[PDB]
Design a protein around this ligand. Sequence first.
Ligand SMILES: COc1ccc(Cl)cc1C(=O)NCCc1ccc(S(=O)(=O)NC(=O)NC2CCCCC2)cc1
Lengths: 845, 133, 133
Amino acid sequence: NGCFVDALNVVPHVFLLFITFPILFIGWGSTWLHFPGHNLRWILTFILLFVLVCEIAEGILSDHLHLYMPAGMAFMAAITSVVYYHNIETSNFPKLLIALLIYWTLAFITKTIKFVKFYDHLRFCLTGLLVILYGMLLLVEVNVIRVRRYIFFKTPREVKPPEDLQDLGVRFLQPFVNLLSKGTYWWMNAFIKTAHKKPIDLRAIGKLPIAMRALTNYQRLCVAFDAQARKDGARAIWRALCHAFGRRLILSSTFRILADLLGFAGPLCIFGIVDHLGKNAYVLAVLLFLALLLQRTFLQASYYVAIETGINLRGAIQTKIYNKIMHLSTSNEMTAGQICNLVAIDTNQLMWFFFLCPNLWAMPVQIIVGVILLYYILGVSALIGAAVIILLAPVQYFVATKLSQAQRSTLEHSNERLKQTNEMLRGMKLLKLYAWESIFCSRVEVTRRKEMTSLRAFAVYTSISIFMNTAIPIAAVLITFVGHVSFFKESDLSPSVAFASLSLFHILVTPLFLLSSVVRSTVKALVSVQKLSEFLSSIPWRACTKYLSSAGILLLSLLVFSQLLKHMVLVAIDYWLAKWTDSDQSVYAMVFTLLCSLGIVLCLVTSVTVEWTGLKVAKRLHRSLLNRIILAPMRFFETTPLGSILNRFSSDCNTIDQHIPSTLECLSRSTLLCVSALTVISYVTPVFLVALLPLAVVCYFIQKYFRVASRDLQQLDDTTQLPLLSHFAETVEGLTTIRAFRYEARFQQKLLEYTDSNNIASLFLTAANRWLEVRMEYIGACVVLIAAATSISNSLHRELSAGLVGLGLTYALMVSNYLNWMVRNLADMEIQLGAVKRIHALLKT
Amino acid sequence: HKNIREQGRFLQDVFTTLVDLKWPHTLLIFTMSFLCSWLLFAMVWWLIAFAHGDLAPGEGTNVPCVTSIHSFSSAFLFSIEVQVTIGFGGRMVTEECPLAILILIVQNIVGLMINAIMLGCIFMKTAQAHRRA
Amino acid sequence: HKNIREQGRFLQDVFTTLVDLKWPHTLLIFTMSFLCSWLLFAMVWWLIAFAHGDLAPGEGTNVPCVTSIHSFSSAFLFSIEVQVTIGFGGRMVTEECPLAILILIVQNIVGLMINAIMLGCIFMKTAQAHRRA
Ligand SMILES: COc1ccc(Cl)cc1C(=O)NCCc1ccc(S(=O)(=O)NC(=O)NC2CCCCC2)cc1
């Protein structure tokens, strides 16, 4: 009686879905109470979601409606259980919980009957997993009734909802939300929507929870330092920090490694789909969708947990070294500058190293899984390719080091220039009273040429970096595919093999760059902690239009058309590989080699173009600014403060030279790669095009609401950084007066206040970045889901063309990362262009 | 109001909560009450006719607990026929199965109770005279 | 009173307006509510039986969605049979057409809602104690 047991299973889901609707409709028509097992409940509910997807897959394979209805009903039943638990977290009851418990017991009974009747005779594993999950959720409910007094005698002795994160006005509620929103940052919707209208400020911002303050982190760190020093240094302080920050860091690291595993897993199911159609695929498509969303969610949660641990550590060691500043002796100018660098660069190094700590653990497993996976797909030839990409990682590091050296030299020259300016902008009336100004401007221009000379080598190294970035992906495929078929064994290379190798090449290129910066950050952090131990123990298109018109018509088109042609080559190589796959193999491989050479030559040309153009623009802009400032009237110089006039030259110039060319290059590459990927996934499946324009319009709404806040928070950060450092300096000089007045307590209070005001800003900023990241990624996974779902049917059932699905899947598996690069670089370019606009504001004097 | 220590009394006022609502929401939740109950008992009846084996189309050696029942659709028609007390009588519940007698004797009383509350509360609503305010 | 800037609240008090009325007017508007609804659904049922083609008298190759329906008159008899919950059962709605199931499942709920209001408001009326004034 199989259908009989199927119906018997359908019944309890129906019972629960029917009782949920009155209460849900009353509730749909500010104290958060959490219960033990909440996080376990949500984890188990997501596992139920997964197993139910698998059951739906089984029902599709078998088909008989009544035979696969139980899965479709348990789906809504679990979603309604989630709705119930949200309605109970928002307002507590003893009865709604019993309402859940009844359903759990009945579903367990039905599943047991299914299991018995099966034992008497794929289904087996799924039914067993569901049984185990329902049983564990039952035990969770029993724990919940055991905790409070719903079935017990009258009173609960109920907790009294937590005042830490729910009492007096606060806004950053990360630890006090639903474990789904703890992942998807849903609580930021309200903040960002309100931020769109009203400008954010410290009165509109929250206050940090008791879970993360100066006092809390200082307390944990001093407890660890005490427990380590009572057993008596650099290693000591290190182990103290380690044992003090404990579980959060390793939790982030394991989130990260699981995400890395699933990311290495994606391309293999791509490969399986490509195999199946050329010779069980819808299941692989939905599994790919699920795995993408879960992997990226875990990656983002990992990032956030690491960032928060780092912010805790910064606050802690900052207030600690300020506590040490009170007890130091007067015999120990140079020490003050060393102290304020110990807070401005050493502490930032420590905290950014703590950002990158889990990446250092997750990188080796990533490259190992990558190489072993690509070996089993391409054989011995794979190994050869696996060398080339890896060889880029040490070289990169070398390049980076050269940059640093260059930077140092340049900085020196820059400093001297500033000196030769500070005189002219002070003896203004003296200077213009006899018109010796041109004589000094000649000297100022003499310094500028030396500065320009340094910048050439720096930008050459930047060009080499950008060149290798996109050259190694091309070279890997070149020397691998040419060295696999036409060299070793003449093995027929199915489209699946080549496209899986392509996907893995990108998924391995992305982490490789980060290892170099990680090594540099780690050694620098080691040096900075040795230092700390030695111390402690003693904008419109008009701004960009003018910026690019200062370059001239000579280089504008030379840049733009070269970029367009490089991206066209980068897509055409894969387009021709698509026809290469199905099987004149030798002629095919030769054409592939020609395309590979064109790509690298064009990339080098584009990089050199960007370098030369940026340098020329900086030159002309500086000269024009100097000339326009020279011919100003005296009353203008007397009216405007010196800080603004000097500051533009001091930073604006420096900022532009250091960051505008690289960021502009990155923005251009990102936007063109995204447009190319969209065009590829459109040409592969025509109908998919018409489905992708809706989602993209969604991104437009996600753009505005982001920038109008991301800019705002940004500037707030800057402000909370300025009085903090200055405060430090004030304590160092007048140290004797402050230790004499015995005013140490009030000043320590002020510094805790300032570090809290800094942390709230630097925390909301990372929360907003996580928000934009996760939502853009969810859409980037929706697009690949829809693309694969259209490709499996349209390109197989009717079109019956296999070279198509490869390109579409390979580009849709990665379009999301290009999208994120695009949006972030766009925000940075906008803030930098807004910085540039004030130079033109000064130009019209 | 901010920071209300909700101890659940907001829903504990079960009908004095929803008699406050607008008309579309209250009409929605009333139709959802009625459809919920009807579908629940239609499912249980479908199942009981399936289980007795009267659902298996056969001539002789049996009499269905509910005469002339064929599929889920006719079963839901029987549920709405007995629940809301129209009583069409094309499908007859018979004196062969006392289990069907039990399901009827609970169906009707729950139907009558939920009808009684869903009339009292709508009347308690039509004494909304705030409009006179 | 003269020159009342009517913003419509005079009718916005929909039932607290008519519970003020006399008895003949209120009885008139109640019978008009009931007859209006009955005629509406009788028309839609006539049309659906016409459209399915079950209205075309034919023996075999079909079963009418509503057994034994011939003309508009018998259709209006079916409408008043299912609406006001007498349920005569001479004409049977069948499990062949789900569209008839939908029309029944909305007919009955609207019938029940308009019955509920037309009882609550008449009771809210019988608390007219101005006669005691
Ligand atoms: C570039 O990505 C990655 C890709 C892959 C891997 Cl395996 C690691 C990373 C990575 O970055 N490593 C984690 C550490 C990290 C650092 C910065 C960022 S972040 O996103 O650029 N910045 C923020 O979130 N907030 C900032 C933080 C500084 C104060 C101001 C707000 C995100 C994360």
